[PDB]
Amino acid sequence: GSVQIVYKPVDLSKVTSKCGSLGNIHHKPGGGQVEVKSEKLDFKDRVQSKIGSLDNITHVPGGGNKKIETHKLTF
Amino acid sequence: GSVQIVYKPVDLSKVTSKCGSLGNIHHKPGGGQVEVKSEKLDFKDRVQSKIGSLDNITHVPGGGNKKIETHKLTF
Amino acid sequence: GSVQIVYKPVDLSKVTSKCGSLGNIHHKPGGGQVEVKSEKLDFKDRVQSKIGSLDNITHVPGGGNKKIETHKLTF
Amino acid sequence: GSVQIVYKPVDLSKVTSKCGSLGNIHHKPGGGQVEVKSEKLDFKDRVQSKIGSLDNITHVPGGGNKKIETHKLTF
Amino acid sequence: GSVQIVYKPVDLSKVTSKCGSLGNIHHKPGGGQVEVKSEKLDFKDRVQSKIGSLDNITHVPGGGNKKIETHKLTF
Amino acid sequence: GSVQIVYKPVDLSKVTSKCGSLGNIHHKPGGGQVEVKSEKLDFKDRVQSKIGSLDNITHVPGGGNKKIETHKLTF
Amino acid sequence: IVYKPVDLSKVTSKCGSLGNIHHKPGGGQVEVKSEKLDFKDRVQSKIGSLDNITHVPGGGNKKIETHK
Amino acid sequence: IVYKPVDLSKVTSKCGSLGNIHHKPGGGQVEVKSEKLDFKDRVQSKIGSLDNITHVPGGGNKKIETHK
Amino acid sequence: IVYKPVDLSKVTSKCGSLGNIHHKPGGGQVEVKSEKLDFKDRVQSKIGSLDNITHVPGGGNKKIETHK
How far is D56 from chain I (nearest CA, A)? Predict the structure, then answer.
C-alpha cells in the first residue's frame, strides 16, 4: 500500500468595510446666515466652540478588518 | 509503502477598508455669511474655537487591516 | 520506502486601506463672508483659534496594514 | 414748459436650459454577455447594425436659447 | 407746466428648462444574457438592428427657451 | 424751455445652455463579453456596423444661444 | 406633269421583352431533400433559378413601294 | 396634272412583354421532401423558380403601296 | 416632266431583350440535398442560376422600291 495526501484549500474570499460618507450627492446645499452676539459672559472651565453656516463632518474610528487563517497538516 | 504529500493552499482573497469621505459630489455648496460679535468675555480655562462659513472635515482613526496566516506541515 | 513532500503555498491576496477623502468632486464651493469682532476679552489659559471662510480638512491617524505570514515544514 | 424722460429699464433675468444627463449616479451598472450567431443571410438594401453589452447614449439636439430684445425711445 | 416720465421696468424673471435624466440613482442595474441565433433570412429592403444587454439612452430634442421682449416709449 | 433725456438701460442678464453629460458619476460600469459569429452573409448595399462591450456616447447637436438686441433713440 | 409623292411613314415591329422593370425579383427560399428516388427517363429540374427567356421567330417587316 | 400624295402613316406591332413592372415577386419558403419515388417516364419539375418566358412567332408588319 | 418623289420613311425591327432593367435580380437561397438517387436517362438541372437568354431567328427587314 501507499499514502497520498493532497491539501489544496482555495481562498477566494472578500472582507470589506465601507464606512463614513460614500457616494452621496449634495446639490446646491445652502447654509443660512449665522449671527452670534455675545456680551458679558464668564467661563470658569474649558470651552470648546464651533460656529458655522454649512458643515459636512465624517468621523470613522471603526471599519477595521481582522482576518486570521491557520493551516495545519500533520503526518 | 511510499508517502506523497502535496501542500498547495491558494490565497486569492482581498481585505479592504474604504473609510472616510469617498466618491461624493458637492455641487455649488454655499456657506452663508457668519458674524461673531463678542464683547466683555472672561475665560479662566482652555479655549478651543472654530469659526467659518463652509467646512468639509474627514477624520479616520479606523480602517486598519490585520491579516495573519500560519502554515504548518509536520511529517 | 520513498517520501515526497511538495510545499508550494501560493499567496496572491491583497490587503488595502483607502482612508480619508478620496475621489470626491467639489464644484464651485463658496465660503460666505466671515466677520469676527472682539473687544474686552480676557483669557487666563491656552487658546487655540481657527477663523476662515472655506475649509477642507482630512486627518488620517488610521488606515495602517499589518500582514503576518509563518511557514513551517518539519520532517 | 420743460420735459424730462428717464429711461432706465433694469434686466437681471436668467434664461437657462439643462438638457441630457445631469448629476446622476450610475453605481456598478452591468451589461451581460451578448452572442450573435448568423448563417445564410442576404441583404438587398442598406443595413445599420449595432451590437454591444452596455450603453449610455446621451443625445441632445435640443436645449439652447433665444433672447430677442428691443428698446425704442421716440421723441 | 412741465412733463416728467420715469420708465424703470425691473426684470428679475427666470426661464428654465430641465430635460432628460437629472439627479437619478441607478444602483447596480444589470442587463441579462442576450443570444440572437439566425439562419436562412432574406431582407429585400432597409434593415436597422440593435442588439444589447443594458441601455440608458437619454434623448432630448426638446427643452430650450424663447424670451422675446419689446420696450417702446413714444413722446 | 428745455428737454432732458436720460437713457441708461442696465443689462446684467444671463443666457446659459448646459447640454450633454454634466456632473454624473459612473462608478465601475462594466460591458460584458460580446461574440459575433458570421458565415454566408451577402450584402448588396451600404453596411454600417458597430460592435463593442461598453459605450458612453455624448452627442450634442443642440445648445447654443442667440442674443439679438437693439437700442434706438430718435430725436 | 408634276409628280412629287412623299413617303414620311413609319413601319415598326417591337417584339419580345422590351422596357420591363424587374426590381429585386428574388425568390422563395428553397430546400429540396431527396432520398432513394429512381428515374428511368429524362429529367428537367429547375430549383430557385430566375430564367428570363425570349424567342422571336417573328417581328419581321416588309415594305414594297412602286411608281409609274 | 399635279400628283403629290403624302404618306405620314404609322404601322406598328407591339408584341410580347412590353413595359411591365415586377416588384419583389419573390416567395414563401418552399420545401420539397421526397423519399422512395419511382418515375418510369419523363419528369419536368420547377421548384421555387421565377421563369419569365416570351415567344413571338407573330408581330410581323407588311406595307404594300403602288402609284400610277 | 418634273419627277421628284421623296422617301423619308423608316422601317425598324426591335426584337429580343431591349431596354429592360433587372435591379438586384438575386434569388431565393437554395439547398438541394440528394442521397441514393439513380438516373437512367438525361438530366438537365438548374440550381440557383440567373439565365437571361435571347433567340432571334426573325427580326428581319425587307425594302423593295422601284420606279419607271
Answer: 38
CA–CA gap between residue H55 and residue G55 (Å, rounded): 5
Give the burial class of D38: count Cβ atoms within 10 A of its Cβ; 0-12 exposed, 13-18 middle, 19 or more buried: middle
Please report the resolution in angstroms. 3.0
B near I: at least 3 beta-carbon pairs less than 8 Å apart: no
CA H12/CA H22 separation, integer angstroms: 25
Experimental technique:
cryo-EM
The full DSSP string for H5-26 is -EE--EEEEEEEEES-EEES--
Comparing C-alpha atoms, which of G50, E40, D48, G32 is closest to residue F40? Answer: E40
Q: Is B34 on the interface with F (CB under 8 A)?
A: no
E42 Cβ under 8 Å from any chain I Cβ: yes
Q: Is C in contact with I (3 or more beta carbon pairs below 8 Å)? A: no
CB atoms within 10 A of CB B75: 12
Give the C-alpha separation, D31 to E59, whole Å.
Answer: 20
Nearest CA in chain G to H31: G31
| Rounded (5°) CA angle A16-A20-A21 | 115
Q: Choose from D2, D39, D60 for mutation: most chain E CBs within 10 A.
A: D60
Across-strand partners of H17?
G17
The grid coordinates listed for C67 are 500582514
The three-state secondary structure class of D32 is coil
Q: CA angle G16-G19-G23, nearest 5°?
A: 110
CA distance A64 to chain F (A): 24
Q: With beta carbons less than 8 A apart as the criterion, state whether G27 and H28 touch.
A: no
Grid cell in block for residue I16: 429580343
| F27: closest chain A residue by CA | A23
